[PDB]
Amino acid sequence: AMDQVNALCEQLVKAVTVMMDPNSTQRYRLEALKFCEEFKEKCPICVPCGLRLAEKTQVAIVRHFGLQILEHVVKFRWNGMSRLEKVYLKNSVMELIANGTLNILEEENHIKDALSRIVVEMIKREWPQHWPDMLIELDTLSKQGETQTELVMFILLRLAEDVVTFQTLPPQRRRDIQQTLTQNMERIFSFLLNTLQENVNKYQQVKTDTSQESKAQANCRVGVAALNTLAGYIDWVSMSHITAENCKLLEILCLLLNEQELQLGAAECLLIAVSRKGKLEDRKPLMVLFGDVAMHYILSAAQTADGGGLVEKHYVFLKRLCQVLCALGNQLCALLGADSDVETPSNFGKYLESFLAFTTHPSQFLRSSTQMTWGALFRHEILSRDPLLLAIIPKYLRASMTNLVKMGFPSKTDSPSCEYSRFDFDSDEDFNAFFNSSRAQQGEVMRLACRLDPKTSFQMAGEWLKYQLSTFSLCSVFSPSFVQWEAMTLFLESVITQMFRTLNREEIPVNDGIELLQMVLNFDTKDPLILSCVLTNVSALFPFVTYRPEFLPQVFSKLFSSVTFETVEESKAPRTRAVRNVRRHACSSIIKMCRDYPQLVLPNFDMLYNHVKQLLSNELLLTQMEKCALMEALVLISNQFKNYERQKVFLEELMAPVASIWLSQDMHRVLSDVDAFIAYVGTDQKDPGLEDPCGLNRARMSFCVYSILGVVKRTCWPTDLEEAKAGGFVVGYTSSGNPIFRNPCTEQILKLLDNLLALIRTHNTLYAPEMLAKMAEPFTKALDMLDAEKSAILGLPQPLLELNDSPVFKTVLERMQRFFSTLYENCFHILGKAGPSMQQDFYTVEDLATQLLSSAFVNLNNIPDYRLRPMLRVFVKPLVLFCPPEHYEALVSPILGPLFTYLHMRLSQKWQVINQRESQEMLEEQLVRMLTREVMDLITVCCVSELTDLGKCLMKHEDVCTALLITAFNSLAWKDTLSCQRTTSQLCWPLLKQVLSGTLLADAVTWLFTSVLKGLQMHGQHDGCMASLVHLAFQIYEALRPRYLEIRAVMEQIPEIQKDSLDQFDCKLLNP
Amino acid sequence: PQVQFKLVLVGDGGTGKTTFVKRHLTGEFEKKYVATLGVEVHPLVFHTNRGPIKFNVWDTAGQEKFGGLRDGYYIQAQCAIIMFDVTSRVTYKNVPNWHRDLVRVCENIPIVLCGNKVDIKDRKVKAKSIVFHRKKNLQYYDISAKSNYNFEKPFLWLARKLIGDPNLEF
């Protein structure tokens, strides 16, 4: 009625050819496609056609399409088939394996696939119960030869994948084949093992025996299949089978690591095996790999990592072997720590020797990889005490020194590593990113190494220093010297800080210490980048001066000279970055020095005082930033007077010029009036590029702000009570009996507070569009974000400008832009720090809260996101958190109330803009995310500890309370998935848990639950939110539905709810 | 014209395989998702520092009911790109499928994995959750056919791999 077998085969050949034709009419294509679909659905003689096309004579393309048919029939048409038809199709396909395919070495990989897919498809249709002799049938086919055995391996691996890993079958049918698999798993895995074992053997003697290449090549190909298909089971199957015959499977897999043709397969089996997670006791037998026998083949294969140039085949094996060795160490670390029967392997020395082989190899990738396992080895409760590990650290750190040197670019040719870096990373950018992030992790691991062998680490950091000191825009840049110096510094500094934690007060190489300290001191450079390492090496070595205070002056000399300039050139050329970097770096070391050893710097105080006084004498000489770092340092030494009045007098004298300029009559006007202010700073004016007087003004104002902040941040009573008493710092003691301190800088700072709040208020007012429009067109984005700060928070990276260059010149607009951002943050910083510094002399200030509200919180409606975030973090968070409860009433309450109300309102409106939906807008979306997190965090830290005192306390307030609940439950509706869980689990609940008994205004109850639901509505998709929100929804319907009845009102508006199933649950809780 | 290589493009329906290619060839962005039927082979020429290099790109339809020969298009391929969408979590789940199918039919070919449409508001598939490429030792590049972010990176890497010249420039 339809067609004859002969006729269809003909068109099917014409259709497969047109489809494979790269250059065929698109129209002929569709008709070919439409032919085949129809054929595969309706044609009753498909199997005769499939078997015909599928036959060895045709072109591979055609054979494959024949086989694809026989697969499509098993897969879509089995149910519309007679028992006889099936038995016929089965026997034909089984015949196909028997001898309907080409022999082994001829025969495309794809045909083996297509034939294989058909068997697997029939196995999944009916393996356990209608096809019981399948395992025997395959076992029979496999004895016929290698072409067959390979085919069986293709099938057992596809079958293992589809049912277990991809599990692509209905749940029910899937489950039964897996149970069957497991039941037969000893048989199946025994079969995989012996196949492998014999095939390898035959390949063994026959390999190098000239007149037998075809059989060596064949027995090999089966090995590869076995290893491949084994790799399908090795991770999922019970550990019984792996361990099976005195662990023969794992033994051979090690032996095969030294056979070039089977290694990658065997490495891949080892890898999966040893990454097997789960029950700790199931991994215990993995320790066999540490055995004498296995370790031998492991080490042998690892020794061949001679690294003699990049051979793609070998290097790819090494990347694999390496991961095997990594996982096997993490296994060891995980099994030992748990004391559970696992005792340190005898052969541990061999594992290490072998691991070290990869640690010292040229390849960046290979070295980086070892790090994590080394980090696990070095923090082991037990293995860091192992002496085989102790023994290995000299060789390890020796490796790390080289690892520290930033050599091996994909583009350059300087070192062996360069070759491989090309294999592994597209560009230098991909290389950098890997390198730098690698070295972060490398950092922590190297410390643990030093912590375990402090003597050696110091000795080798020592010798690398002595070495660097005497070796090697045409002065210095990114030359081999600088790169060598930076790595050397970094190692040493790392080594010394570590040493002064582990070695007792007495094991210190003092003599060798000062030895090096001297050499560093006497060394000399006119080159900024080198000096900058010098300065670091001084600070690293500086704990030595504790023993030999004679050296202090030299130390001061070294640092202060660097502060002043870099004699690249003075008032004639522009300041290069590396120059302004060392100066900053020196000033930094000055603070670190004074902050860390101050009894030490103490005897030398007048001299430093005098020095800094001299340096500031010419107001034009140092940077404001430099000026203040020095003042900061001076403050830090005065902490050591440990005496109130003594410090009181110093600081008032230190601050005496700053007070002058700040409390000045015309400064007051500048600080209070917006027009006075715009004036002082030069946004009023259009020489369209001679800002000149404007700059100096806005630098003096920065100077005061920088100072006030400096003093507040650093001033300190003695940290020892008994001592704090004696210098007259203790004012009395708390109810709980904790001393109450007064701080020497209180009187002085408090005097500057009115002008600060003055400036703060004014600065905030400038953000009004009618104030902002008062700026001149040159400077209209004076108060916008620096393009620096933009690509910053969009993740859009930057190029690295050379430190020997000043190409980016400080634009008049960019100059102001930097000023505003810093002045804004710095003012708030002082207020942030005022609380924890002054204590209850700041908190008890009269009408503080009102002053703060009218200044700091004055113009929020116009204050942007990027300003408010800084404000909250730097100012509000600390103001509140450091407040003694006595005044949660006085000021915390009157401030947080209006703040939370506002913030919440601001955010909801911000979120509705976002819910409404190039770079310029997309950017602002990011700032809403970060602000929201900041706000939620602020709320959490405030009352979550269940609530803190000021949690309880703020709740016992009308406005505060409402604002905390609204905000918290509204958070669930914002599209930021990070806040959902945080707020839900930590915040939403204990808030309601506080306002159970009493007034739960009916309208409030209904809203609360609707808002939790909007949460489930917004998120949904995300497993984190949903679970967490469901539970929270459940807690509200359970503490609130025994009392109120309007909760159910809400439930019934939810799409698809059986009211009957509701009723049943509703009454279940209203009875017992 | 010179060497010429066979390139196989696989992945779920709607991950933008056809649009990625239509771009490279013409240089225009296609908006409507007209479902691909089977395959559409496209030649792409790349004047390198080593001469012109051609790419026969087999744009195979990854819609269940529309792939023609499917596995048959992989026949004698020499490099492949497996593509998925970051809007659809499902498409990254299905990557190991597209992979098993490829290596089985033609083993040892360089494959590049590609997460498309990174220009879309919020990525459901987070850049940190992408680990498959590391377990199967393949290259990855998140990309966009509307944005052109890493537009040529997959071709360049393949080209680099086939010719065995790490310094190869497009």
Added chain:
RNA sequence: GGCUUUCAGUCGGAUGUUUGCCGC
């Protein structure tokens, strides 16, 4: 239902390390 260890996710907290930026 009452009490716990192991294994992946989504966070949370605490240290630690690294990389950017800081002439106003």
Added chain:
RNA sequence: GGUAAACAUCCGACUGGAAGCU
């Protein structure tokens, strides 16, 4: 020195994958 962002080690908050227990 300060500030922001990445990663790593450790001890909870819940979703889900094996069991011990009153």
